[PDB]
């Protein structure tokens, strides 16, 4: 937990998020275009960081914004509120949203708590926890989140894992036979989700989606995320794993605005995420690839990813276990 | 410390070090060419990782090798010891070298405990701690470590970091004035040591050298490291900061072998490290740039670095703090 908040205490890391124009600009649009959800309202910004989203709420006419931040970035946010002459409308509260007190309930909660695969870092639990401060029938921005999953083919990505692991498959590395560790090295590489982007042409079926409605969901609902899937294959080929991305929707009174990290959309700082299967699966066009993706929360602020999958027509099966806390940036 | 040993538990990270041919090859040359320091001797490998250095000690004819390793990599080392039929000579000992109980005093300690700028990660303290197991006559491989510092000029590097920091100069980022944080951003960005390599042509004077003798140094000596300097400037220009590298020497009974990470030598996985000044110092050829680099060990297995430098001929001074645990790896 200390390292987590120390990371967000760096201005360079806040800057990284601020500079993601799709992200920051879409939040600004969502808030300003839904000005009646803000005008003269009370706002909670969960994990304000620099304060940027709270400034957008102020731009849209909010009366009072409580900006809660657990890292030492709270001190820098405070400097910005004073220097932007907004002391009377934005109040920076240092600490965890789970531990602080607010002086009143709010009309609307705003936050950017989305990790890789939507759920990484487990901050959505803090966002849902914050609903203890939300007036009855208050709103949340973002309001819902969709995680999409789809099968891909990438022969070169799959092959790469062996190329790397075959370092160990040599009998005389400076006189040492390394070969006995090759299997362990393979296993290690396959446990890493791959964070990068890709051409949509690699996708072999229409995505399935799993939706969380943040107005209704409880913290505990994010501890175990079960995503069944049944893909009807558009192309014949070897399925090397599943690709993941996510969308959030800001459902306001005037309009619904979407922030998407899909591979069809301009790139964001989240990229997309791919989990390889241990062993690829052959599927022909029209076959069904079924199984479940289970995301199991862990004590390292992340998830273990369990994927089991089969091609129904053949019965050939595969699986993988991945560690979302150890992604490979490709 | 839990994260620290977890990192070294990954085979991919052990591979990264092993695939540094200069590093791994030079360790092997040092050990094999000084085989009389190993022949029928007792050896301690501090932080054996894959076991690689312990295999080198076995190649040189060591009677018995205690291969100490605190990460889960210990289990993989033992797989290799067995698959290489060396259970008779290499004894993997899981745990911290500070906390295990070896049955025997040793003739020689081998290790690769060097971090960025030599001292990062504080593993040299574990290496020095291990001297409780060293016989009076005993040797250490490496035997000494030299840190080199020299002033550099690199306007492109300076402007890259300055431009990042000046994101926080913006008076209207999506309508928001960030400019009150300009100074805080410059402080943070310039606290990051820059890890990459560079052309030697950027160096403005001969390096100053600080030496640690591992045969004599006590663990506590590395808690405060004071390196005074007085550079005789060989070129006129802006001094953008100090560049650091390090060498280690294996002082064997037969021969001394050096492993160098200098920018005049083939690249190693350590690259070199540069500490930028927030504002460069103007110097003329013939001037003297004097001051002190002070490294203070901290509770995050790293060092707070203080660099105070002044051009004596003008009184122009730069004071800098750097966080050796937050390096910027530049592509
Ligand atoms: C706040 N919303 C946008 C976050 N958006 C910018 C930040 C980015 C990110 C965060 C973190 C979070 N962090 C400091 C952790 O301690 C942590 C915790 C749980 C899990 C986790 O998994 C990762 C491991 C390696 C690399 C990245 C994550 C990291 C680390 C690195 N990069 C993630 C993407
Ligand atoms: C054993 N000698 C060779 C090590 N050689 C291969 C490993 C390489 C390295 C080690 C570490 C050490 N580590 C796991 C830490 O927890 C740690 C501890 C203290 C400080 C520290 O400073 C860094 C911060 C960011 C990136 C790197 C270091 C890291 C992390 C990343 N890369 C360093 C170089
Ligand atoms: N439980 C919690 N309570 C308070 N702040 C938290 C928190 N969990 C995460 N945070 C903070 O939430 C922020 C997420 S990054 C988003 C920052 C900013 N709102 C923006 O959109 O640019 C980080 O600054 C992190 O320190
Ligand atoms: N105090 C300590 N006790 C035991 N092992 C340690 C230690 N401090 C660091 N290590 C281990 O020392 C190793 C340093 S990396 C070098 C690995 C190997 N000797 C090689 O040269 O290739 C890591 O595997 C790390 O886990």
Author numbering:
A (entry chain B): 147 to 476
B (entry chain A): 147 to 477
Sentences from the paper on this structure:
Protein arginine methyltransferases (PRMTs) catalyze arginine methylation of proteins, which involves the transfer of the methyl group of S-adenosyl-L-methionine (SAM) to the terminal guanidino nitrogens of arginine. PRMT4, also known as coactivator-associated arginine methyltransferase 1, is a Type I PRMT that methylates arginines 17 and 26 of histone H3 as well as non-histone proteins involved in a variety of biological processes including transcriptional activation, RNA splicing, cell cycle regulation, DNA damage response, and cell differentiation. PRMT4 is dysregulated in several diseases and has been linked to breast, prostate, and colorectal cancer and positively regulates transcriptional activators including Wnt/β-catenin in colorectal cancer, estrogen receptor-α in breast cancer, Runt-related transcription factor 1 in myeloid leukemia, and the Switch/sucrose non-fermentable chromatin remodeling complex in breast cancer. These reports suggest that PRMT4 is a potential therapeutic target in certain types of cancer.
The co-crystal structure of PRMT4 in complex with N-methyl-N-((2-(1-(2-(methylamino)ethyl)piperidin-4-yl)pyridin-4-yl)methyl)-3-phenoxybenzamide (TP-064) provided structural evidence for the specificity of inhibition. We found that TP-064 inhibited the methyltransferase activity of PRMT4, with an IC50 value of < 10 nM. Surface plasmon resonance (SPR) analysis revealed that binding only occurred in the presence of S-adenosyl methionine (SAM), yielding a Kd value of 7.1 ± 1.8 nM, with kon = 1.1 ± 0.1 × 105 M−1s−1 and koff = 0.7 ± 0.1 × 10−3 s−1 from kinetic fitting. The structure showed that TP-064 was bound to the substrate-binding site adjacent to SAH. The methylaminoethyl tail of TP-064 occupied the arginine-binding pocket and formed three hydrogen bonds with PRMT4: two were between the side chain of Glu258 and backbone carbonyl group of Met260, and one was between N1 and the side chain of His415, suggesting the importance of this moiety for strong PRMT4 inhibition. The other moieties of TP-064 engaged in hydrogen bonding with the side chain of Asn266 and hydrophobic interactions. In the PRMT4 complex, TP-064 engaged in a π-stacking interaction with Phe153 and formed a hydrogen bond with Asn266. Hydrophobic interactions with Pro473, Phe475, and water-mediated hydrogen bonding with Lys471 and Ser146 were also observed only with PRMT4. Although we did not observe a clear pattern of competitive inhibition for TP-064, the crystal structure showed that TP-064 occupied the substrate-binding site of PRMT4.
